[PDB]
Amino acid sequence: SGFRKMAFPSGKVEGCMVQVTCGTTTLNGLWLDDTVYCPRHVICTAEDMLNPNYEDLLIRKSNHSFLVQAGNVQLRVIGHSMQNCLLRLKVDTSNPKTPKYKFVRIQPGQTFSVLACYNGSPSGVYQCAMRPNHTIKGSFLNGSCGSVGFNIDYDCVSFCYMHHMELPTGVHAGTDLEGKFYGPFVDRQTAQAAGTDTTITLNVLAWLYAAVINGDRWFLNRFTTTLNDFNLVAMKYNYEPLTQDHVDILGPLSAQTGIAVLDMCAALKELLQNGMNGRTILGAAALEDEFTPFDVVRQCSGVTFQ
Amino acid sequence: SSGFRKMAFPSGKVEGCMVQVTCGTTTLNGLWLDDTVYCPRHVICTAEDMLNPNYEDLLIRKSNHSFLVQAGNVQLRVIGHSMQNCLLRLKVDTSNPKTPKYKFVRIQPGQTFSVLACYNGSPSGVYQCAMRPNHTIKGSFLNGSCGSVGFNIDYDCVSFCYMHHMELPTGVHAGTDLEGKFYGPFVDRQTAQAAGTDTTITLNVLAWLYAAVINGDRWFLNRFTTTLNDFNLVAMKYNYEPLTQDHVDILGPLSAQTGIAVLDMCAALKELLQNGMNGRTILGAAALEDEFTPFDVVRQCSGV
C-alpha cells in the first residue's frame, strides 16, 4: 500500500465549464456569474498566432462574433473586453452553478487540480504542480486551452491557473485568472523554451514527513546538518536550494512528527547519495515532489467544518 | 509532443450522490441513487460485533429508526431496508434528483477506476487506481472512507464498480462491487486475513511503455525481439503477471501505432527489468507504472 496524490472534487468547477468558439477556433471557458473567461487567442487562427496584435483583432470583433455554449444551450454574449492575455465575455445569463470563488496567483512549487476539458466538456481531473521553471507537466492534448487549475478551501474554489499553449518540451504554459502568464512565456507561437527544471525540494521533504506519518521511517538517522551543507549536496543532485522560508512551510509537519526540518534534511541528503538500497518509501520507487506541506496535512486528516 | 498524467474522471456526478449513514455510534458513507441508499452492512456493528458478527441476526434486531441518513444538512426518512450480500439497501422517500445515468459493473483485476474518497458523506478527493492483482487496492483511505465508491464514465453514464469496506492490516484496502460481492478472499470481519501475494500488472506496464514511446521517449528499445514464453519465464521471476496471447492482442493498436511489435516491447521490458533502468527515467517517472491500462493510453492519446 501507500499514499495517493488526490485531486480536489471537480464537481464545483465542472459547473462552470463552457465552450467558446470564434469562427474556426474552439476552446474552453470559465463561466463565473455573468462572465466567461478564456485565453485571448480564441480570436486567432493560422498565421495570426505567429505574432498577432490582439488589440487590433479584438477591436474588429463583435459580440455576435463569439459563440458560447454550455451543454447544448447557447449563451448570448453581450459584451467583450481584454484583460492581459485573457478575454472576458459578458453573457445575458448568470451561472446559477457559480461557486463561492476567488482568483489567486500561485508561487512556483505549489499545487492544484486541473479539470481537463475538450469543447467545453470535462474529460478528466488531475493533480499537478507549478514547476520551478513555471510550467506544468500535464496532459493537454489538442484543444485543452481554457482548462483551469483550482484549489478548494471549504466551500470556496480558488481558481489559480488557465491553460493557453504548449511549449516544445511537451510541457504547458498558462496564466492566472487575471490574464497574467506564469514564467517568461507570451501567447505567441514563437521560439520559446522552458528553462532548466529542478526537483521541488520542499515537496520532497513534505513527502518524507508524510511517509513517516504513515509508519515508513527506516530512512531516518541521529544526525542533523546545516541548511548550507544540505544545499551544497542538493545542488549536485539537481534539487532546489532549500530556504529558511521553506523550512517554515514545513513547520506544522515537523511539529506533528517531532522531526526537525534539518534532521529530515540529513535524511534526504542520504536517500540522494547512498542510493536507496532497493528499499522503498510509501511503496513507490522514487522520491515524489508534487505533494506540498499543505497537501500532506490535508490528506492525512478529514478536516473539520461541517 | 509529450506529457502523460494519470487522470481520474470528473467526480461531479458522484458527489451528487454522497451521503452519510449513521447507526449507533458508527458512521460511514453511502451512495444514493433514486430512492435507494447503499453502504457496507457492517455499519450496524460496534466494536465486539465486528469479531464474527451474525449479520442476519444483527439486522432483524434493527429498524428504519436505527438508520440516520444525512444529505448535508438534511435527514432522509429511511422507509425500509434489506441486505444484499455485504451491502445494505436502505429505501427512502426523497428520490435523489442529481442521480445520473448509472450502471453497476464488476471490474477485473488490472482494470482501472476513479475513487471518490469521502469522510462523513462529504467529498474529500478523487484519484485513479487499479484493482491490484491480489484484489486489494492501495489508496488514500484512512478513517471512515468506508462506503466510498470507485467508478468509470462513458458519455454521461457512470459505471459503479467498487465500494470501500475495510482497511486490511498490510495497509491496503478491500471492498465489494455495487452488489455486495466482495473482491478477493475477504469478509467483513476483524480477523486474521491479509492481502494475497501481489504482482505488477504487465499488460499495463507495456501499455505505459508504448505511451512513453508515442510521446517521444524511446531510449529503452532494442531491435532484438524475444518470444512470448521466454518473456514470462523472465517476468515471473521479477514478480510480473504472466502475459497471455490475449494481452498481446490487446496491445494491438498500441503497437500498430508506435510501429513496435508487442514481442519487441517485451524484449525492452526484459531489459528494463534486468538492466535496472540505467538510473534514467521513462515518461518523467523513475519507476515503471502499471496503473494504466492499454485503453487508458488510447483514451489519453487521441480524444476525450
Side-chain angles (χ1 to χ4, degrees), chain A residues 1 7 14 125 137 139 290 299, chain B residues 5 8 12 15 126 140 171 300:
Chain A
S1 188
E14 283 169 52
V125 63
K137 308 182 175 182
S139 182
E290 287 218 335
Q299 188 166 180
Chain B
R5 260 300 195 305
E15 306 172 20
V126 73
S140 183
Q300 184 179 166

Side-chain angles (χ1 to χ4, degrees), chain A residues 107-155:
Chain A
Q107 293 283 196
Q110 289 171 306
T111 68
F112 55 89
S113 294
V114 175
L115 186 70
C117 289
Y118 291 105
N119 300 291
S121 191
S123 166
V125 63
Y126 61 78
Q127 244 275 160
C128 60
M130 175 58 75
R131 286 271 121 207
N133 65 27
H134 313 287
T135 69
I136 71 181
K137 308 182 175 182
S139 182
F140 289 150
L141 277 62
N142 52 63
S144 53
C145 306
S147 299
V148 301
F150 59 90
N151 272 291
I152 301 181
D153 333 66
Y154 300 98
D155 52 10

